């Protein structure tokens, strides 16, 4: 059914603060999580820390990194499958590395006795003394042929000592001692000819073609974890077309059991902010040869004539998957965009130049380029901005932030830590989804008066706008607008920065 989900850290081998602070995060991140949308990296956990909360993890889409841990036992006893929608050091779905103490003793017990499927990628085990029994699991079953050819992993005996495995174990396989805590094959103990996985350690009563790990039954409804699309209680390869062909009339008919395709789940309707293709699937962008003329309240599109009205990718995607901030090197690629088809990261390093990525400091004047962006299909993050300027100008004509993608999976607009006197997004009229966070902006007023409850439309959108200037401390600088504008705040002082106007007005300004 429905499982609790977490983004999943994704900053491998990096240490967040102190062994403890690092810990507090790992805990804050995965506590209660049942599915890990991104990655599961457990590193730097110490000698006597409680990683009990990991017993709730049933699946991880990306990969599982476990390296540099002194802790002794890791509770990932309930992990079932590792999709491997991403890799560590390339070609690694599960990378367990250097888990030793200066005393040569760290990780010892890895109860992953349910990890039965690793859809993609290879597993690597190297330099982890104390690791016991794990060196007995035959992965020819946990991993899939296509990779057990690139998976490096040898185990070394340690100075300590650990019991063996109960005589109930298969060909040895056992993630520890417990009770029947032995690797239970469901891929090899299968019969000559069976679709895919099996639960019958031999019988021809095996699992449905669409199932990873195993299946309580032989049907499509009785399965440990779905391999591809999860449609309600069933596992699907593709989801019910809104239109089925009719072999008799050589024409197309509508399908009652037809659903839309959102991610891996199969919805009845697409989220109000995603694009719905006539096909019947929810996407985050229309072709390079199309528009987005939302119609019956639902966004849709029609192909144009070849290259259409500018569609820039936006930091962090395709031609930018490696860049972490709009900067000189390639800001040029935003010359005449009216829509950024991704996110926008304006970071500090951009303005000071990263000598690590070989990029010259961004010319403040260049941000004027963006002054033509009208909408951002994803999220707009800004942790920096030119000094001698008090206004998010480049985004004066931004009118919509779709929030198809958000920061930390949560924020769609994030203006944090600037010295700007005000926002100035006086054109913004929509924040489709995601939360707005505006804080740490020393001398920024007016913000606490936006009535965002109108500027955006989706259940759950919050607004953490804290620690800025000071209301009862900014009225003194006359920095307000309450008089000529209206209840719906302002984006600045001037009569053109109003959110709503008293007595209809013209000139994109009011008076």
């Amino acid at each position: 059914e429905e499982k609790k989900v977490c983004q999943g850290t994704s900053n491998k081998l990096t240490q967040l603060g102190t062994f403890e602070d690092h810990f507090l995060s790992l805990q804050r991140m995965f506590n209660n999580c049942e599915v890990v949308l991104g990655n599961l990296e457990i590193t730097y956990v110490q000698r006597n820390y409680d990683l009990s909360f990991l017993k709730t993890i049933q699946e991880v889409a990306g990969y599982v990194l476990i390296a540099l841990n002194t802790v002794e036992r890791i509770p990932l006893e309930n992990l079932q499958i590792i999709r491997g929608n991403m890799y560590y050091e390339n070609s690694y779905a599960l990378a367990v590395l250097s888990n030793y103490d200066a005393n040569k003793t760290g990780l010892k017990e890895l109860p992953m006795r349910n990890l039965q499927e690793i859809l993609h990628g290879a597993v690597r085990f190297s330099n982890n003394p104390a690791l016991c029994n794990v060196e007995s699991i035959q992965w020819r079953d946990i991993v899939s042929s296509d990779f057990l050819s690139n998976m490096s992993m040898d185990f070394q005996n340690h100075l300590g000592s650990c019991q063996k495995c109960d005589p109930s174990c298969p060909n040895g396989s056992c993630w520890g001692a417990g009770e029947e805590n032995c690797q239970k094959l469901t891929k090899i103990i299968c019969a000559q000819q069976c679709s895919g996985r099996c639960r019958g350690k031999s019988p021809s009563d095996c699992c449905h073609n669409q199932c990873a790990a195993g299946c309580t039954g032989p049907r499509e409804s009785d399965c440990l974890v779905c391999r591809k699309f999860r449609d309600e209680a069933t596992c699907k390869d593709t989801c019910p077309p809104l239109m089925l062909y009719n072999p008799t009339t050589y024409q197309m008919d509508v399908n009652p059991e037809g659903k839309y395709s959102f991610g891996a789940t199969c919805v009845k309707k697409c989220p109000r902010n995603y694009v719905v293709t006539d096909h019947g699937s929810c996407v985050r962008a229309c072709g390079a040869d199309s528009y987005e003329m939302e119609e019956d309240g639902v966004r849709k599109c029609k192909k144009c004539e070849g290259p259409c009205r500018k569609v820039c990718n936006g930091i962090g995607i395709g031609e930018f998957k490696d860049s972490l901030s709009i900067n000189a090197t390639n800001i040029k690629h935003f010359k005449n965009c009216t829509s950024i088809s991704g996110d926008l990261h304006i970071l500090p390093v951009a303005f000071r130049g990263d000598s690590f990525t070989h990029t010259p400091p961004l010319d403040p004047q260049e941000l004027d380029i963006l002054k033509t962006v009208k909408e951002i299909t994803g999220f707009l993050l800004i942790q920096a901005w030119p000094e001698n300027r008090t206004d998010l100008h480049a985004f004066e004509n931004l009118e919509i932030i779709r929030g198809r993608t958000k920061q930390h999976g949560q924020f769609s607009l994030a203006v944090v830590s600037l010295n700007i006197t005000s926002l100035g997004l006086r054109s913004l009229k929509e924040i489709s989804d995601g939360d707005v966070i505006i804080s740490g902006n020393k001398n920024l007023c007016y913000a606490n008066t936006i009535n965002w409850k109108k500027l955006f439309g989706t259940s759950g959108q919050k607004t953490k706008i804290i620690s800025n200037r000071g209301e009862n401390s900014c009225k003194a600088t006359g920095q307000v607008c309450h008089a000529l504008c209206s209840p719906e705040g302002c984006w600045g002082p001037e009569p053109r920065d109003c959110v709503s106007c008293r007595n209809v007005s013209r000139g994109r300004e009011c008076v």
Binding site: T9, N11, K12, L13, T14, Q15, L16, G17, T18, D21, S25, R28, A67, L68, L97, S98, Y100, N127, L324, S325, H345, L347, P348, V349, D354, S355, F356, L381, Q383, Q407, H408, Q410, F411, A414, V416, S417, I437, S439, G440, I466, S467
Partner: protein, 47 residues
Amino acid sequence: ECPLSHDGYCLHDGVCMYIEALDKYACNCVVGYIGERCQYRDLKWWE
């Protein structure tokens, strides 16, 4: 510990370190910043 190259690797006053055990270079980011180079402020927490 990190080479002149990785000098500037970690942002937001983070310190680069050499994981001898895994022969790599990582960041010991100051509290509050996440990401391999500590690029993002942890918005979903404080300030």
